[PDB]
Design a protein around this ligand. Sequence first.
Ligand SMILES: [Mg+2]
Ligand SMILES: [Mg+2]
Ligand SMILES: [Mg+2]
Ligand SMILES: [Mg+2]
Ligand SMILES: [Mg+2]
Ligand SMILES: [Mg+2]
Ligand SMILES: [Mg+2]
Ligand SMILES: [Mg+2]
Ligand SMILES: [Mg+2]
Ligand SMILES: [Mg+2]
Ligand SMILES: [Mg+2]
Ligand SMILES: [Mg+2]
Ligand SMILES: [Mg+2]
Ligand SMILES: [Mg+2]
Ligand SMILES: [Mg+2]
Ligand SMILES: [Mg+2]
Ligand SMILES: [Mg+2]
Ligand SMILES: [Mg+2]
Ligand SMILES: [Mg+2]
Ligand SMILES: [Mg+2]
Length: 131
Amino acid sequence: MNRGALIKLVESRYVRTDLPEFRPGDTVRVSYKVKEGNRTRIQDFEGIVIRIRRNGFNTTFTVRKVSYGVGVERIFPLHSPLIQKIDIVQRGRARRAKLYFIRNLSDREIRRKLRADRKRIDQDRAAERAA
RNA sequence: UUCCCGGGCCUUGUACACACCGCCCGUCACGCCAUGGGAGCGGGCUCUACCCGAAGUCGCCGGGAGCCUACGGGCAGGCG
Ligand SMILES: [Mg+2]
Ligand SMILES: [Mg+2]
Ligand SMILES: [Mg+2]
Ligand SMILES: [Mg+2]
Ligand SMILES: [Mg+2]
Ligand SMILES: [Mg+2]
Ligand SMILES: [Mg+2]
Ligand SMILES: [Mg+2]
Ligand SMILES: [Mg+2]
Ligand SMILES: [Mg+2]
Ligand SMILES: [Mg+2]
Ligand SMILES: [Mg+2]
Ligand SMILES: [Mg+2]
Ligand SMILES: [Mg+2]
Ligand SMILES: [Mg+2]
Ligand SMILES: [Mg+2]
Ligand SMILES: [Mg+2]
Ligand SMILES: [Mg+2]
Ligand SMILES: [Mg+2]
Ligand SMILES: [Mg+2]
């Protein structure tokens, strides 16, 4: 038997392919399904992805933002059915996979440390030319 | 005729005139009032140094690059 393939097989029913590719440092908008009262709604969480934790179907990513003077971090399963869509709002270029360090940085310092990833921005623009 | 008691005349000092049985000082005791000191406690104002920093004018850029061309330009946008 191949235990890995069995697991991949169980996971296959839940795997997602509709979400855009992004890297740590990119700024991302996650439209997330949420439950309140008496209804469910979609709430956008927009911020820098500081971490992508890979384990295939089980990979998760972490998005950090400042909300009314307070740092907030959300952890999302990359294949969650509660993510309606993810929008790339900016491409950042980091020089490491985990950006924990920006927790200690001023907004000004972060803006210096993560400059726009012009290579991947151009790529986005080259695509998005629809036939 | 020094002393005690009463008085008369002259004079002298007096913070006494209720007139020396006068006036009056301070502790202590009780009561009230205001202030000072006092481990500290609370608050107001202020000064200095540094960290972060909105809006905004100003200055640079405006390109791996968008839009308007009015194209040796402008706006977006970026930096300070
Ligand atoms: Mg396994
Ligand atoms: Mg199998
Ligand atoms: Mg909301
Ligand atoms: Mg942020
Ligand atoms: Mg849905
Ligand atoms: Mg006599
Ligand atoms: Mg006589
Ligand atoms: Mg006499
Ligand atoms: Mg005398
Ligand atoms: Mg006299
Ligand atoms: Mg007292
Ligand atoms: Mg006192
Ligand atoms: Mg006192
Ligand atoms: Mg005092
Ligand atoms: Mg005080
Ligand atoms: Mg004080
Ligand atoms: Mg400091
Ligand atoms: Mg400053
Ligand atoms: Mg130009
Ligand atoms: Mg400007």
